[PDB]
Amino acid sequence: LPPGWEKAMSRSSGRVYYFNHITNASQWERPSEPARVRCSHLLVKHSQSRRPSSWRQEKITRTKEEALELINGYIQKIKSGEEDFESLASQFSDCSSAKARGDLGAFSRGQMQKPFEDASFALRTGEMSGPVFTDSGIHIILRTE
DSSP, X not given: OOTTEEEEEOXXXXXXXXXXXXXXXXXXXXXXXXXXXXXXXXXXXXXXXXXXOBTTBSSOOOOHHHHHHHHHHHHHHHHHTSSOHHHXXXXXXXXXXXXXXXXXEEEOTTSSOHHHHHHHHHSOTTOBOSOEEETTEEEEEEEOO
């Protein structure tokens, strides 16, 4: 397999799947570096976030465990097609980029928080991350270019 990916076995069905420990993506299909990428994200903050505050909520009090549950729920809805990433980012991202459907614009290595950067540059175009953790909170990242 490519770097970043490993083969795993579903705990519930026993079927082979693939997991990326850089992006925290997981998928059933066997997966097949850019100078700059463009990403959107949805951030869910928690009480240990660097700044436990956002446009949504002046005092963010949720636990990091509660923040992860919210992230996992949004990922489920996005993957089911029940909701679009853009819709959920606009409504629920704890960051002012919510106003741009989560878009952060284009960037190179050396700009973003490292876990976010590493996930961003390891995603394929159009691919979405699993939960990514930074000092800001927990992120869902969508690489758009």
